[PDB]
């Protein structure tokens, strides 16, 4: 969710915008740690696939079901 | 090739058959060693995928190409 907040803040809020200046400390390092998770942790054959029971593709299917339950109220 | 020989020898050559008695020492442990290979070594996410450059699916295509080149004379 924060990466979605991070990318959209960069893409659509310029440096003069007050909402950008509000949110730019709160999106620090979010894109890299999500990239590092997608590269090392939750990748196919990553660290999640060596210990967690939802690894090996089941966590992706769990992420799809969770995204359907990802409501704004939650 | 040894696994194919082993399985065909077990399926088609009974214990009475001389060619079975001839080939049974030469097919010992082949099925288990290949099963362990297909479980731990050449499987998706296996040791091959963790170190070797053809791992992760390329080795299967390479195996298909080699099987096309797997001639009797070779």
Swiss-Prot record, chains A, B:
Induction notes from the record: Down-regulated upon starvation, by UV-irradiation and 15-lipoxygenase metabolites.
Cellular location(s): Cytoplasm, Cytosol; Membrane
The organism's place on the tree of life at top rank: Eukaryota
Effect caused by changing residue 17 to Q: Alteredarachidonate 12(S)-lipoxygenase activity and protein expression
Phenotype for residue 51 to I: Reduced arachidonate 12(S)-lipoxygenase activity. Alters the stereoselectivity of the oxygenation reaction
Residues annotated as signal peptide: none
Tissue specificity: Expressed in vascular smooth muscle cells.
TM regions (residue ranges): none
Summary of the function given for this chain in its UniProt record: Catalyzes the regio and stereo-specific incorporation of molecular oxygen into free and esterified polyunsaturated fatty acids generating lipid hydroperoxides that can be further reduced to the corresponding hydroxy species. Mainly converts arachidonate ((5Z,8Z,11Z,14Z)-eicosatetraenoate) to the specific bioactive lipid (12S)-hydroperoxyeicosatetraenoate/(12S)-HPETE. Through the production of bioactive lipids like (12S)-HPETE it regulates different biological processes including platelet activation.
Disease tied to this entry: Esophageal cancer: A malignancy of the esophagus. The most common types are esophageal squamous cell carcinoma and adenocarcinoma. Cancer of the esophagus remains a devastating disease because it is usually not detected until it has progressed to an advanced incurable stage.
Family: Belongs to the lipoxygenase family.
Annotated protein name in UniProt: Polyunsaturated fatty acid lipoxygenase ALOX12
Species annotation: Homo sapiens (Human)
Residue window of the full protein shown: 367 to 440 of 663
């Amino acid at each position: 969710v924060a990466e979605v907040i991070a990318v959209a803040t960069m893409r659509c809020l310029p440096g003069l915008h007050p909402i950008f200046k509000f949110l730019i400390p709160h999106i620090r390092y979010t894109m890299e740690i999500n990239t590092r998770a997608r590269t090392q942790l939750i990748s196919d054959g990553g660290i999640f696939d060596k210990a967690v029971s939802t690894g090996g593709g089941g966590h992706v299917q769990l992420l799809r079901r969770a995204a359907a339950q990802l409501t704004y109220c939650s």
